[PDB]
Every structure is written in C-alpha cells, then in structure tokens.
Design a binder for this molecule. Structure first.
Ligand SMILES: Nc1ncnc2c1ncn2[C@@H]1O[C@H](COP(=O)(O)OP(=O)(O)OP(O)(O)=S)[C@@H](O)[C@H]1O
Ligand SMILES: Nc1ncnc2c1ncn2[C@@H]1O[C@H](COP(=O)(O)OP(=O)(O)OP(O)(O)=S)[C@@H](O)[C@H]1O
Ligand SMILES: [Mg+2]
Ligand SMILES: [Zn+2]
Ligand SMILES: [Zn+2]
Lengths: 385, 385
C-alpha cells in the first residue's frame, strides 16, 4: 500500500494536469517517474531501486497483467475511478535492462456513444454497412488492433438495432457503458461464468440480438457461430488486423468452414488516425507519383490536396486534436462464401472482395486525408502491413 | 405474496394473449417486464427495483432452482396449473449487471399442431407440397431460422402420413411434443446418444418414416441421406436462408452430390409473418410505383387489396394479431437433379426451380399481403427476397 498509494497519487496528479502519459522507468540506482505535459516529459518523482517490483505489481493488478511474467511485454487497460477522477489508462509493461518499465497512457474522456451516422463512414461504405447490420441474423465481426475503437462502434450499432420488440443480450469483459434498453452480463471467472458458459445460457434466454464482447476461445467461437446459424443476430469482436484474416482466424479456432460460410454476414476492420487541427491547418501539395502509387485514379490526381497541422497549443504539440476512424468493410456475398468453403487464403478473399467494390483502409484513409481530416502519414502508419 | 400475485397474473396474461415468452428484466432504476407475442416483444409492466429478488424467488421455487446462487445461470421445468391453466413452463435465470433476469417460456402441446390444410399454403403450392410428402421414400428438408414454424410443419406432416401400417421413428433434441402414434427418442449427450448414433440404430429398427430434428454435424447429414437412399422416407430440419441453399449446405457438410440428387424429394423454406388484426383492419390504397419495383405486374396491382391494422386493445396497439406462414417449396425434378451433380450453385438451382414453378419467400409473402392476410412491411422485414 506504500506502492498502491504512490500509484494512485501519480494518476491523480496526472489527471489534474491533463498529462497524456506516465512513465515508470528503472535506472541503475533508482526508479525515475515522468509525466508528459504539453508534449514533453517532466521529472515527477524518484523511487528507490527496491521499490520497483512493488509498484509494477500494483499497475499489473490494475490492468490484469501477469506478475510472474517479466521476460515479455504486456499491454492492458485500466478503467480507473477513484472519486472525482475517472480516467481510462492504456497500460504497457516492458522488460528493460534495469527491470520492468511501465507506461500508462491517459485516454481522452470517452464522451457518449454516437449515432451510426456520426461514426465517420464514407457515404458509399456507409450504405453497405447499414445493410449489413439490418439483417435478421448471422454474425457480424468487428476487428482491429488494441484500441481501434471496436467496442465504441459496437455500441453505436446496438444503439440503432436494439429496438423494444427485440431482446438484446450482451456478454462483456468488462462491461463498459450503461446503455438502456438492453441486458448486459459481465464475465465472472471467479464464479465460473465464462464467455462460453454465458453464451450457452443466452440461447435459453429467448434472444434476438447477441453481442459477444470478445472471442478468444474455440468454445465461444463455436457457440456464437451456431447462434448466428439458428437465427439470432450476433455482433462480436476479434483482434485481427485484416478483415479477411478474421475468417481465417475463425477456422483456426475450430469453426467448420461451412458454418463460417453460412453464418458470416461481413467483417469490419477499422483504425484510428489522429485528426489535424482545424486552426493551424495548411495546404500541402502531394507528389502525383505518390498518389498514383496509392491506387488513386489519374483524373482525380489534379484536385490533389493534402493537409497538415503546423501546430499551436490548441493542439499542444502535434498538429493534431481528436481522432477519426478508418474502415474497410468486407461484405460477404455469394462469391466470397464460395471462396471460404473452398480452400481460401485471406489474400484471395480480399481481392475477391475488392473486386465487387470493397474499399480498403488505405483507400478509405487516403480519401479522408484528401479532405483534411488526417495527414497521409497517419494513414500510412495505420495501414502498413 | 405480492410477488406471488405478480407471477400468477403475468402467466395468466401470457396464456390468454398467446405469448411465447415472459421476460423479467432488471434495469438501472426499475424492473421491466415484456411479453413476446407473435414473435415481437411487447411492454407488459414495470416493477419497482426492490421487488426483483422476491419475484425471482417465486420463479426459482417453481422450477426448483437454487436461491443462494445468483452468479450463475439456472434452468428448470414446471407444469403450471392455476384455475383452468395447464401449461408446461421452461424457466431460465441469468445474472445481469442489475441482477438476475428471468425468462419463462410457455410450451405448446400436440393439440396445437395443425392439419396440413391449415398450414397456410397457397392453393398452387399446396398440391405440390402434398405430392412431396406422399412419396414412399426420399429425404425432405424443412429449412429456415428458429421460430419459423419448422416443427409445426414437421408434425403436421407426420399427423397426415404416420399411419398405423408404418414405423415412424423420431430423433430429437429435445423432444418437444408428445405425439400419439409415433416413436420418439431424445438426444442424450451424457449417455453418448448422438443424433448420428441414434440414427445408426434406427436402420436396424425396421423404420418407414424417419424424422431428424436437426442436422448439425457432417456424419448425421450423411446417414440421413443414406437412409433416404435405401428406401426410407426422411423428414429433417436444416438452417438456410433459402430452399436452394439446403442442397448446397449438404454438399458443404460432406454429402456426395450424387447422393443428394438421388435422395432429395424437396426443400421447404419457411418464415412466419404477422396477421393483420381484424379489429383494426383498415383498407389502404396501394401505391403502384412502389408495387412495381417490387416485381408485381400491372394485372396484380389491380385486384390488390392491401390492409393495415390501426392499433387496438385486442392487438396491443401493434396492428397485428396472430401469425401466418410464407412458403418457398423446392420440388426436385430431373433438371434440378442434373444441376445438383455437375455442382451448380444455389443461385443456379434457385433459378431453375423458379422457372419450373417455385414461388420465392418474397413472392408467397406478396401474394398473401395482396389478400390482406398480412401487411407489406412484414413481408419485406421477413424476406431478403
Ligand atoms: N470513431 C472514433 N472516433 C474517435 N474516437 C474513438 C472512436 N472510437 C473509439 N474512440 C476512442 O478511442 C478509444 C478506443 O476504445 P475502444 O473503442 O474501446 O477500443 P477497442 O478497440 O474496444 O479497444 P480494446 O477493447 O481495449 S482492445 C476510446 O477512448 C474511444 O473513446
Ligand atoms: N403455420 C403457422 N401459422 C401460425 N403460427 C405458427 C405456424 N407454425 C408455427 N407457428 C407458431 O410459431 C411457433 C414456433 O414454431 P415452431 O415450428 O415450433 O418453430 P421452429 O423454430 O420453426 O422449429 P423448432 O426449432 O424445431 S421448435 C409455434 O410454437 C406456433 O406458436
Ligand atoms: Mg472492447
Ligand atoms: Zn493547431
Ligand atoms: Zn387490433
């Protein structure tokens, strides 16, 4: 609790300062602590060398990390409420030559779950998206790397489709949000209430819409798929970078390809790019050759404006305030499941979908960058694979 | 006794309203109770939040569930008798963030099962339906999501064709109705009595008619087809959005296409639409332009009498009371047989079937909406065409 009270004092003073990050760094003879204020790291405090393991355990408990594991990096998430400071923290631990270093990123205050029309879909992709989630049943997968806005998009969907004539039931680890009109159930491993234990009880609970917060079992993948097969609408998340790899991911978790093919409505992969500041924004002229290589049509290449923030402190550092989302939406059709039943590659499906008109993250990112929402760099950074 | 009084009333009201399920839902500041009627959830009442644990208690006593346990789902069965009420109830309790939700399902009986004349078949389809079930051997598939009326149709058929000169054998998970005249067997995991293990045994039981409640696995799909092949009549349920996809799905499940083309009598795809309440029923002047994009001809727009129910006390305000089935009946002939082998797609099969006389779900829906059985939107909400 010497350790616990230090950790809680740091997060507090980080919150009140509007600090973005907190670094706990072992050194040769001490542990330095630093806070990023207005873009720069500042010295907060100094802990003795022996104090290291104590503190690292406290933040590991907070994010559900493994204490025993010290040779490998771990990431986690901390929903932190103590009194008047509620901040969500992104947690990172890293093996360092002097012991384990921890970094906690203070996330922007979430605000409220938006309507479907304010998620930042391209006008064209939006219509196909609205058609995927309006379907009576089947499973709709939302994927992306840690913190790409999966849960946020998921609840925006539920906000739309969970009508009083339906039973919307939810399994989450943990439950975020107090969204009305639906029933929410949190995973309890203490009790024995796993994802699969719950998901099987849900089938005896007369559901219409099932939201599976996370699929990380074979049991869960199988049950969610059969729920989609028998006539329920399932929304679930995976942690996969490619929309097509989500299909392959399910094959690996033990789902029969013919069941994947019969239930899957589509897969949404998204990213978050920083938004350029509207105030210190400037026009930039792109190398036509770059645009060309990015698959942008010649005949579109003359309008040709890209944008970037030089910076003020409405931005702080950066030229960026806020984040926006990037999407590629794999809508399953007669030909795609016609590729899943056959031996597939994620690769083959992707271009089988691109033809038929599927717009890719980079294409989606590029086009929003052409609007001055984001830089081309942020777009490239998120789509490099 | 106040919680006893509530449970008594809500089951009484569900019974008289023909309600599938009672939902008792803990929410943030109250308890909400919903009735599913005609497949649609409907608000029944609100309880004050501190009355939850008394009500759940009554429900648990009925089904012999543990009161102490509130962290894990529970399941029960009760034969409920109050006044003249005699219903079997299936009880489900499930922990949510605001406490345990309860679902009580009102179960049907054999007496509720219709005669095939009352299944709602259009006159042209009904004559073909009859010729399909009156064949000596082959496999007949009934497909669609849960709550489509698959079991009602199945046993309706067995009421007409399980005459006393034949052995009529059933494998079910679970056995729902107790039917006179036929032999029924329930799937039992704990003993190892699979669908496939049961079905293997049926072939040494001198059967005539075989009913497979559900085809989930690849082995069951093969043995049921084999049993059809050798000279037995097989009625089985599958989940597909479409009659033609039942062919493709058997393929995907591993059945040899030459075996499918050899054994398959036909497929029935089925949905349930809501009937227009006839205490609200008000005639509505059709819009021709909207009836033209919907593939209806000029002749059909004449002789078109649409209706919509202007909500009343008897329909709970919905404008609907009762349900009705819409049908897509694929009847296998030689051309469909040659297309099943030669591995044509479901879309190819479907277009063959229609040219040969098959009405799609949408078309059967539209046809009955023009009779004022149901409304247009119900047809559009229950069919992706
Ligand atoms: N479309 C969006 N635009 C801007 N910010 C967003 C958007 N979606 C999410 N965010 C924010 O970004 C953070 C991402 O949180 P989530 O939406 O929960 O991400 P996630 O993919 O669920 O991440 P996990 O669950 O930790 S792997 C939250 O702080 C959201 O406020
Ligand atoms: N032809 C019909 N017309 C009107 N209501 C019907 C009809 N068939 C079924 N129903 C109602 O719909 C409910 C569900 O029908 P079921 O046949 O039991 O459902 P199913 O999901 O299609 O088949 P299962 O999963 O093996 S019970 C029945 O219990 C009846 O209340
Ligand atoms: Mg999440
Ligand atoms: Zn700026
Ligand atoms: Zn009415």
């Amino acid at each position: 609790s010497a350790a616990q009270k230090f950790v809680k004092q740091v997060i507090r003073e980080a919150f009140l300062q509007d600090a973005s990050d907190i670094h706990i760094e072992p050194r040769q003879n001490d542990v330095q602590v630093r806070l990023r204020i207005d873009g720069a790291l500042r010295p907060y405090s100094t802990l003795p060398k022996g104090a290291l393991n104590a503190v690292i355990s406290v933040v590991k408990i907070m994010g559900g990390l493994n204490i025993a594991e010290k040779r490998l990096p771990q990431d986690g998430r901390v929903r932190y409420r103590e009194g008047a400071i509620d901040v969500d923290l992104r947690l990172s631990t890293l093996p360092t030559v002097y012991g384990e270093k921890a970094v906690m990123r203070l996330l922007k205050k979430a605000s409220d779950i938006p309507e479907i029309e304010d998620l930042g879909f391209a006008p064209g992709v939006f219509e196909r998206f609205k058609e995927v989630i309006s379907k009576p049943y089947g499973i709709f997968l939302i994927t992306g790397p840690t913190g790409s806005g999966k849960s946020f998009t998921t609840f925006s969907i539920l906000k739309r489709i969970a009508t009083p004539d339906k039973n919307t039931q939810t399994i989450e680890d943990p439950v975020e949000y107090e969204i009305p009109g639906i029933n929410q159930t949190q995973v309890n491993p203490q009790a024995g209430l796993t994802f699969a234990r719950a998901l099987r009880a849900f089938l005896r609970q007369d559901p219409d819409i099932i939201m599976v917060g996370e699929i990380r079992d074979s049991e869960t993948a199988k049950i969610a798929t059969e729920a989609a097969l028998t006539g329920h609408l399932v929304i679930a998340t995976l942690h996969t970078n490619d929309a097509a790899q989500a299909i392959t991911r399910l094959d690996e978790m033990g789902v029969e390809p013919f069941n994947i093919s019969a239930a899957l409505i589509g897969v949404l992969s998204q990213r978050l790019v920083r938004r350029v500041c509207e105030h210190c924004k400037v026009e930039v002229k792109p190398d036509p050759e770059t645009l060309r290589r990015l698959g942008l049509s010649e005949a579109e290449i003359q309008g040709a404006r890209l944008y970037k923030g030089m910076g003020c402190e409405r931005c702080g550092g950066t030229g960026y305030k806020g984040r926006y989302a990037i999407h590629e939406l794999l809508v399953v059709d007669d030909e795609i499941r016609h590729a899943i039943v056959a031996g597939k590659s994620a690769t083959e499906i992707k271009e089988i979908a691109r033809r038929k008109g599927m717009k890719t993250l980079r294409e989606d990112g590029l086009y929003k960058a052409l609007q001055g929402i984001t830089t081309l760099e942020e777009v490239l950074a998120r789509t490099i694979e």
